[PDB]
DNA sequence: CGCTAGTCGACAT
DNA sequence: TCGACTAGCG
């Protein structure tokens, strides 16, 4: 997710009800419900005590969608993307230390203080996601396990016309080139929709708004692939892109100080950090449900080299990708975990 | 004042 | 985690 992105675009959003998508297909960033559902049972979850509470939470939102005659597609995160293996590292350690403090430091005697820590040490495993897939499948709800980030997978589904909108809490999905995003949707269907169409109404990126620039803005402000330089946020990011004349972005990156009337040096490893991050947004591997084949979110254009795009997801045989997408294989060990058949009835 | 970058709550009762 | 909010510098 991009920090403070939603406030920034708070004007391109119309309050809606999910009802408008009756008869239509809607993709879901299931992680959001999984996390919210994991909060209610933070204790049981942290101490490794058995629980199914989070499953019933996701299904509550599923049933609401069905009751409105909406066809949901639950999408799940797949493999750890190398571009994020860096940031995930820092997050692995936070849950690591956070769990421990709460676990015994507040276990003895009083407990009120500790739970605040367990909620911050919540881990959404693949085991937890598989339970939700099982529950959804039994009710005829489609589930899809992204090769890597659900974010890319969701964006693709929306672009391909497979789904009419995406349900999530993450505004950053628009940077992946998705068309419609439903935020803050409650259990009753009340949501806050943001259409990419109303997103071009912005003039903070210059006279001509561009998806390309919006993406640069998000990266410069800082994201999961590349942290921002000290003192750079969305507003400053807009200024640079807004003021900058020259098309090559790398030329502009070293020019930011010149643009921002501010004095700062851009490290060489940062230059590459922006090149990778940008390519990750563009060409992150996703799964095409129709042709059942691994494809980059965006088709490789005039000049690229897929062989150098290892950080944006490594290719694997299409049969291996299908089995992961279906939920029939473990992400890490590729062991059998299910036998769902998509080609029946 | 704008703007970045740091705590706090989420669910459930 | 993730946004919503505040504090505190340019
Ligand atoms: Ca995500
Ligand atoms: K930042």
Instruction: Say if residue A165 is in the same domain as residue A242.
Output: no
- Determine the Cα–Cα distance for residues A204 and A238; give it in Å rounded to an integer: 6
Instruction: Say if residue A166 is in the same domain as residue A307.
Output: no
**Last residue within a domain, chosen from A259, A284, A309:** A284
Task: Give the number of other CB atoms < 10 A from CB of residue A108.
Answer: 8
- Determine the Cα–Cα distance for residues A283 and A148; give it in Å rounded to an integer: 12
Considering only residues 80-99 of chain A, list those whose CB is below 7 Å from strand C.
90-91, 94-95
DSSP-based three-state secondary structure for A26: strand
What is the domain range of residue A340?
285-345
- Determine the Cα–Cα distance for residues A130 and A180; give it in Å rounded to an integer: 27
CATH of the domain at A266: 1.10.150.20
Q: What is the resolution of this structure in A?
A: 2.5
DSSP-based three-state secondary structure for A341: coil
Instruction: Say if residue A200 is in the same domain as residue A238.
Output: no
**Is A146 in contact with A77 (CB distance < 8 Å)?**
yes
Q: Which two tokens stand for residue A134?
A: 């099982």
DSSP-based three-state secondary structure for A157: helix
What's the A32 CA to ligand 1 centre distance in angstroms?
Answer: 9
Number of helices (H) and strands (E), helices first, in chain A? 14, 9
- Determine the Cα–Cα distance for residues A176 and A195; give it in Å rounded to an integer: 13
End-to-end Cα, chain A, rounded Å: 38
CA-CA-CA-CA torsion sign (A91, A94, A95, A97): positive
**Is A180 in contact with A162 (CB distance < 8 Å)?**
no
Q: What Rg, from alpha-carbon coordinates, does chain A have?
A: 21
Instruction: Say if residue A305 is in the same domain as residue A324.
Output: yes
For strand B, the positions having any atom within 7 A of a protein Cβ are 2-6, 9-12
Domain count, chain A: 3
What's the A179 CA to ligand 1 centre distance in angstroms?
Answer: 16
Q: Are strands A165-167 and A293-296 parallel, antiparallel or unpaired?
A: unpaired
Instruction: Say if residue A160 is in the same domain as residue A227.
Output: no
Nearest residue to B12 via alpha carbon and C1':
A40
- Determine the Cα–Cα distance for residues A76 and A30; give it in Å rounded to an integer: 6
Distances (CA, A) of A344 to A176, A340, A341: 33, 10, 6
**Last residue within a domain, chosen from A250, A267, A284:** A284
Distances (CA, A) of A227 to A220, A235, A270: 8, 16, 9
Nucleotide nearest to A231 (CA to C1'): B4
Nucleotide nearest to A31 (CA to C1'): C1
Read off the DSSP letter of residue A204: B
Q: Which two tokens stand for residue A254?
A: 């070293």
Considering only residues 139-178 of chain A, list those whose CB is below 7 Å from strand C.
169-172
Instruction: Say if residue A63 is in the same domain as residue A125.
Output: yes
What's the A16 CA to ligand 1 centre distance in angstroms?
Answer: 23
């Amino acid at each position: 997710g991009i920090q403070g992105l939603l406030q920034f675009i708070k004007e391109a959003s119309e309050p809606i009800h999910v009802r408008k998508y009756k008869g239509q297909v809607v993709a879901v960033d299931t992680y959001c419900w999984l996390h919210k559902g994991a909060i209610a049972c933070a204790e049981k979850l942290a101490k490794g005590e058995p629980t199914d509470r989070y499953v019933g939470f996701c299904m509550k939102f599923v049933n609401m969608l069905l009751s409105h005659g909406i066809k949901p597609i639950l999408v799940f995160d797949g493999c750890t993307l190398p571009s994020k293996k860096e940031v995930e590292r820092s997050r692995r350690e936070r849950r690591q230390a956070n769990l421990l403090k709460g676990k015994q430091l507040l276990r003895e005697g009083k407990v009120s203080e500790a739970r605040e820590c367990f909620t911050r040490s919540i881990n959404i495993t693949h085991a937890m996601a598989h339970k939700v897939i099982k529950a959804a499948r039994s009710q005829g709800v489609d589930c899809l396990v992204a090769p890597y980030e659900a974010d890319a997978q969701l964006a693709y589904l929306n672009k391909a016309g497979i789904v009419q909108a995406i349900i999530t809490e993450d505004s950053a999905l628009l940077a992946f080139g998705c068309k419609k995003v439903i935020l803050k949707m409650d259990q009753f269907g009340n949501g806050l929709e943001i259409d990419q169409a109303r997103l071009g109404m912005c003039r903070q990126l210059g006279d001509v708004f561009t998806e390309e620039k919006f993406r640069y803005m998000c990266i410069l402000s800082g994201c999961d692939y590349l942290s921002s330089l000290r003192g750079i946020g969305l507003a400053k990011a807009c200024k640079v892109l807004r003021l900058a004349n020259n098309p090559d972005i790398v030329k502009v990156i070293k020019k930011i100080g010149h643009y921002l009337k501010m004095n700062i040096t851009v490290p060489e490893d940062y230059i590459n950090g922006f090149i990778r991050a940008n390519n990750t947004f563009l060409y992150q591997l996703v799964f095409d449900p129709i042709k059942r084949k691994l494809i980059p979110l965006n088709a490789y254009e005039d000049d690229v080299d897929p062989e150098t795009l290892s950080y944006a997801g490594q290719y694997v045989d299409d049969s291996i990708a299908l089995q992961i997408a279906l939920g029939n294989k473990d992400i890490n060990t590729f062991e059998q975990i299910d036998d769902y058949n998509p080609d029946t009835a």
